[model samples]
Target: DQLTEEQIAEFKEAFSLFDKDGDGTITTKELGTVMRSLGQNPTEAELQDMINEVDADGDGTIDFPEFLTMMARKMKDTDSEEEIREAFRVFDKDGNGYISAAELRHVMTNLGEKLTDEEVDEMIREADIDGDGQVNYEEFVQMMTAK
Candidate 1:
């Protein structure tokens, strides 16, 4: 699944948060430090495995873009249906029971994503069932919930 531009920016911010040393890479120690600072426990096993899985360069550390990819995958896998529904309804502001390309773009930019119209069009292409160029509730659900 493609992430919105804002989500990619957010992931970059998260990578910076974890890269405590400002060295442009996140080591296991840095990951643990950030996790602990957030009051979440990061076991040594957990941190190392996560780094290894996300480290595309095989340098045993996570680069910013690598962490971005990893974060996007995790978000897609982990968000609950209820939570995603809540997010969708907030953007379904017109109560039309569907979200049009314009509305989707508006809401995305409203959240500070600043995506191009063609980029928004890509999202609609992926989620719009029946080739209608809009996302019905079921389509939106399937898009978010799909692998």
Candidate 2:
């Protein structure tokens, strides 16, 4: 299904609002703050997970270009018959394209998964391709699809 322009506008507005610093970038901390302000209050882990979806630069920060490109891609993917030809954007806040043990811990805790460090490591090792201690978008998509 295609998302209406209104929906896209709403998403844009929400994205802008989440960028509290007005620096045209939305960091993991900023995302957490935005979610909290909206009463979602994501845990550290959840925030990490969310960031893992967009930080493509493998840096620990997200800038405006990255964010705007991500949003555009997301909107494109979420739209059918749009042929937006955008990149595969994951909002990985740590910019590593994959989630680390610590990142997974933060996500699991926020999601109420309560996993152990060993379990987190095992998960990363099983899915991470580069073994950089994180699972990239391909790995994540595979994992999600496998489920």
Query: lDDT per prediction?
Result: 0.76, 0.62
lDDT of 2 by residue, 42-98 (tens): 887887766666777756566655665567765445743222111112224456565
lDDT of 2 at 133: 71
Please report the TM-score between candidate 2 and the true structure. Answer: 0.39
Error of 2 at 136 (Å): 1.0
Query: In candidate 2, which residue ranges exceed 4 Å CA deviation?
Result: 1-91
Highest lDDT among the candidates is held by which one?
1
TM-score of 1: 0.49
Q: What is the lDDT of residue 46 in candidate 1?
A: 95
lDDT of 1 at 37: 41
lDDT of 1 at 32: 82
